[PDB]
Amino acid sequence: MPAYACQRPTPLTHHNTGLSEALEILAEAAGFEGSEGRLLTFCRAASVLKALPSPVTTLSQLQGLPHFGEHSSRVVQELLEHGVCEEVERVRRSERYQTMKLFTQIFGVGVKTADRWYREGLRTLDDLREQPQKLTQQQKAGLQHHQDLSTPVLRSDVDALQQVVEEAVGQALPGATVTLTGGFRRGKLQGHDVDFLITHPKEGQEAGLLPRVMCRLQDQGLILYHQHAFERSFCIFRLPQPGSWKAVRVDLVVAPVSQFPFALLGWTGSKLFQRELRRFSRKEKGLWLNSHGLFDPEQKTFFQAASEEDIFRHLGLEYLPPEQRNA
DNA sequence: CGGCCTACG
DNA sequence: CGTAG
DNA sequence: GCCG
Ligand SMILES: [Cl-]
Ligand SMILES: [Mn+2]
Ligand SMILES: [Mn+2]
Ligand SMILES: [Mn+2]
Ligand SMILES: [Mn+2]
Ligand code: NA
Ligand code: NA
């Protein structure tokens, strides 16, 4: 079992679902208390279990597995013995956890905002609605649309949304392309948002594209919310439904064709996979990776990539298709 | 022990 | 501060 | 919380 998640296939579905879910509760809880290191370890340990070829049935099967020490091993031990880990259940039940989860799930609210609101004694969505003078425009949108945004986005929704984005992109800039990214590209059947990456085969033609796309979607009556030389737009779309509609989070991202493979890689995820890939790149290969490129700080050069395959090769990693990047 | 991804709005 | 994967 |  390699130590970095980018060095091993991680399928969407696996053989240790219960165990990984328990560790991810602890990861999430650590994030709520500002401990990113503990979040990372619990996330990595969970991801290791996702990568195993069969279920863990005994404690001995953890021996030698990366990211399993005293704490994560105890969590697994208690689940194997009793079907439940008391620490995990204590977190699930805490007012702190439930409220921080509720608040941080609001679009426009991060851990810091949620925590300050928690400390001020606020607990419910109606508590926030009663004092809306404090809220940002983004948080107001997040709160108004919260119910719809909690409903899973389905594959049918994605196909509908892709068509309308293509229509607007085609008018904004003939020849421009739209690629589905994020969780749906990794094979997920549901999600909480749809991610698209837009480019054009002629380098430079994509300049100024996103405002033109946004203005056109706005005029078609499809934009319930957006933030406005920008390249990422976090929107709430109005998606047609039987006799009605629902609000759906959509991210639209633009990259020049030179950067497309890096942007595609970054935006396809998973979040943990990409953090691990960037960590690997820097620590093991001395190369700096982001969604724009891959930089050699010795030679002071950028690696030209024509594909995701190119990027894995330049990092000395076996290629993983998107459906094996579910770390 | 230090490090933990790296960006844009 | 928020957002993204 | 774990690793390297
Ligand atoms: Cl016991
Ligand atoms: Mn997504
Ligand atoms: Mn998104
Ligand atoms: Mn996300
Ligand atoms: Mn994400
Ligand atoms: Na949030
Ligand atoms: Na850019």
DSSP string, A151-202: SPEEHHHHHHHHHHHHHHHHHHSTT-EEEEEHHHHTT-SEES-EEEEEE-SS
Topology annotation, domain A95-151: DNA polymerase; domain 1 (1.10.150)
- Please provide the DSSP assignment of A64-104 as one string: T-TT--HHHHHHHHHHHHHSS-HHHHHHHH-HHHHHHHHHH
Would you mind telling me the total number of residues written for chain A in this entry?
A: 327
Which residue type sits at A170?
G
Write out the catalytic residue numbers of A. Answer: 193, 195, 251
This PDB structure is determined at a resolution in Å of 1.8
- Between the alpha carbon of residue A256 and those of residues A118, A169, A229, A242, A266, the distances in Å are 42, 15, 13, 37, 14
Q: Closest Cα partner for A112 from A102, A103, A125? A: A103
Whole-number Å distance, alpha carbon A82 to ligand 5 midpoint, is 32
Measured CA to CA in angstroms, residue A304 lies from A199, A231, A282 at distances of 17, 21, 17
Residue ranges of chain A that CATH labels 1.10.150.20: 95-151
| Ion ligand 5 neighbours, Cβ < 5 Å | A 271
Determine the distance between A243 (CA) and B6 (C1') in angstroms: 43
Q: Where does A152-257 sit in CATH, by number?
A: 3.30.460.10
**CATH code 1.10.150.110 region(s) in chain A:** 1-94
**Domain(s) of CATH 3.30.460.10: residues in chain A:** 152-257
Pair of tokens at residue A267: 């935006």
Q: What kind of experiment solved this structure?
A: X-ray
Closest nucleotide C1' to the C-alpha of A191: C5
b/e per residue, A192-229, with b = 16+ CB within 10 A? ebbbbbbbbeeeebbeebbeebbebbeeeebbbbbeee
Topology at the third CATH level for domain A1-94 = DNA polymerase; domain 1 (1.10.150)
The three-class DSSP label of residue A236 is strand
Give me the long-range contacts of A220-225 (CB less than 8 A, separation at least 24). A220/A164, A220/A168, A222/A164, A224/A141, A224/A145, A225/A138, A225/A141, A225/A145
CATH code for the domain defined by A258-326: 3.30.210.10
